Amino acid sequence: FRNNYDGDTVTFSPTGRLFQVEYALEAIKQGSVTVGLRSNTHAVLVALKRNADELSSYQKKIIKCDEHMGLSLAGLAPDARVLSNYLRQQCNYSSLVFNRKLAVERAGHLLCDKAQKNTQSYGGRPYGVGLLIIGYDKSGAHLLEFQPSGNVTELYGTAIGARSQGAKTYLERTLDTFIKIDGNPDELIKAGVEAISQSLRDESLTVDNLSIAIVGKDTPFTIYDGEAVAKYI
Amino acid sequence: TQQPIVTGTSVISMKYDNGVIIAADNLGSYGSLLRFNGVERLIPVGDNTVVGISGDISDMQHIERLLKDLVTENAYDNPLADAEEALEPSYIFEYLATVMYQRRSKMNPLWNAIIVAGVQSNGDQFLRYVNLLGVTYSSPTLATGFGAHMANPLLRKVVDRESDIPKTTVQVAEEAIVNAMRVLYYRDARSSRNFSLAIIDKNTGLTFKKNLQVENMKWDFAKDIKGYGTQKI
């Protein structure tokens, strides 16, 4: 068991499991925590960036995909780059060909299908990264959770990475409050920072440690780093 | 590269205060042979868009099938396919424009001139032209073929600039369209008496009228015309 059935993604275990996919899932858990949440007017990403040394920079975890869509990552950053690039192209294709901003729901379906092809063919490997996609389209604010198994889920709020369960239980309690935060971006970010801090343990949220992103009704997807997020610590 | 065999003549259109009107006759010509008399050259897409097509009929039927596929494909994994994520006139057009320019760039055009008439979700009128060269343009009145030479002059007397649109009613707009179809029946040798007319109104929706005929024609003066100069009887 396990030993014999985890050599490649093309092999089912005797209980119907896909261990290579499950090992890829484990790369996300080792990844640094990031939180997503939304109301009816805005959607917010908050991420805890990780460094190597005190001499090193903090690995950026948020990537803009279009003016109305973007995502945060936990796991293999190179794989997030590939998937975010694909999403950038799909968003771009929709605009050029149909003059239409891509629905966040359709973006989720496209990621699912792209991840799935890597879980059924020989020689490849699953993607070793998880993604939280936020956006504002023709049906309002949206937040998605992408796992490299191919499973994509629309949520009000969630978290991924190490110790992400803390932030997730907080949001699960705070649900009725933060969903009502309409027409107030600062207050949604506060609720996102209070959630991300639930997953802390090692350190405190410093100025070059924290990264935040916001998208909404009259707000293009925009990333905040450094002194721009000093007012939230 | 090709040559058109079975052809449709003018497509004419204009916008009015609350929407757009578009008309085209029911003829499929074969050179100077008036071959087919039951050809519908207005293609409705959903409840908000009508595409009028002139030129090669074999290509028109191909474009017709592309539009049906667009509706099908749009409804896939789309819970809001008949609401917020339904097809807009602008999406239909941009898709067609893309195809028309790519085909001309491959030296293998769809040998047509297309007018997409409709109403966007926000209530705005949509009226835009595209043809075998991939050339696009918008105007308060649009027409293809002979309609460009004879209908536009008459339709522009009603709506000469943007500011004439809110002043123009459905009744006045429709009468102007119907008069233009009579004028084209007088002077276009590839025209038919029978035509279809479509109104797309931001309040009253899509009104499709089939089996219209040119009426109230002036011919009586012809009896007084004898000879070609000097002949009296």
UniProtKB/Swiss-Prot annotation, chain A:
SUPFAM superfamilies: N-terminal nucleophile aminohydrolases (Ntn hydrolases). The keyword Repeat does not apply. InterPro entries: Ntn_hydrolases_N, Proteasome_alpha, Proteasome_alpha-type, Proteasome_asu_N, Proteasome_sua/b. There is a cross-link at K190 (Glycyl lysine isopeptide (Lys-Gly) (interchain with G-Cter in ubiquitin)). The modification Phosphoserine is found at S13. GO terms for cellular component: nucleus; proteasome complex; proteasome core complex, alpha-subunit complex; proteasome storage granule. One of its GO terms (biological process) is proteasomal ubiquitin-independent protein catabolic process. It is found in: Cytoplasm; Nucleus. Its main location: cytoplasm. Keywords: Cytoplasm, Isopeptide bond, Nucleus, Phosphoprotein, Proteasome, Ubl conjugation. Belongs to the peptidase T1A family. The proteasome degrades poly-ubiquitinated proteins in the cytoplasm and in the nucleus. It is essential for the regulated turnover of proteins and for the removal of misfolded proteins. The proteasome is a multicatalytic proteinase complex that is characterized by its ability to cleave peptides with Arg, Phe, Tyr, Leu, and Glu adjacent to the leaving group at neutral or slightly basic pH. It has an ATP-dependent proteolytic activity. The 26S proteasome consists of a 20S proteasome core and two 19S regulatory subunits. The 20S proteasome core is composed of 28 subunits that are arranged in four stacked rings, resulting in a barrel-shaped structure. The two end rings are each formed by seven alpha subunits, and the two central rings are each formed by seven beta subunits. The catalytic chamber with the active sites is on the inside of the barrel. Present with 7210 molecules/cell in log phase SD medium. This is Proteasome subunit alpha type-6.
Curated annotation (Swiss-Prot), chain B:
PROSITE patterns: PROTEASOME_BETA_1 (PS00854), PROTEASOME_BETA_2 (PS51476). It comes from the Eukaryota. Belongs to the peptidase T1B family. Keywords: Cytoplasm, Nucleus, Proteasome. It comes from Saccharomyces cerevisiae (strain ATCC 204508 / S288c). GO terms for biological process: proteasomal ubiquitin-independent protein catabolic process; proteasome assembly; proteasome-mediated ubiquitin-dependent protein catabolic process. Its main location: cytoplasm. Non-catalytic component of the proteasome which degrades poly-ubiquitinated proteins in the cytoplasm and in the nucleus. It is essential for the regulated turnover of proteins and for the removal of misfolded proteins. The proteasome is a multicatalytic proteinase complex that is characterized by its ability to cleave peptides with Arg, Phe, Tyr, Leu, and Glu adjacent to the leaving group at neutral or slightly basic pH. It has an ATP-dependent proteolytic activity. PRE3 and PRE4 are necessary for the peptidyl-glutamyl-peptide-hydrolyzing activity. The 26S proteasome consists of a 20S proteasome core and two 19S regulatory subunits. The 20S proteasome core is composed of 28 subunits that are arranged in four stacked rings, resulting in a barrel-shaped structure. The two end rings are each formed by seven alpha subunits, and the two central rings are each formed by seven beta subunits. The catalytic chamber with the active sites is on the inside of the barrel. Interacts with CIC1. It is found in: Cytoplasm; Nucleus. This is Proteasome subunit beta type-7. GO terms for cellular component: cytosol; nucleus; proteasome complex; proteasome core complex, beta-subunit complex; proteasome storage granule. Gene3D superfamilies: Glutamine Phosphoribosylpyrophosphate, subunit 1, domain 1. It holds the Pfam family Proteasome. The keyword Nucleus applies. Present with 16900 molecules/cell in log phase SD medium.
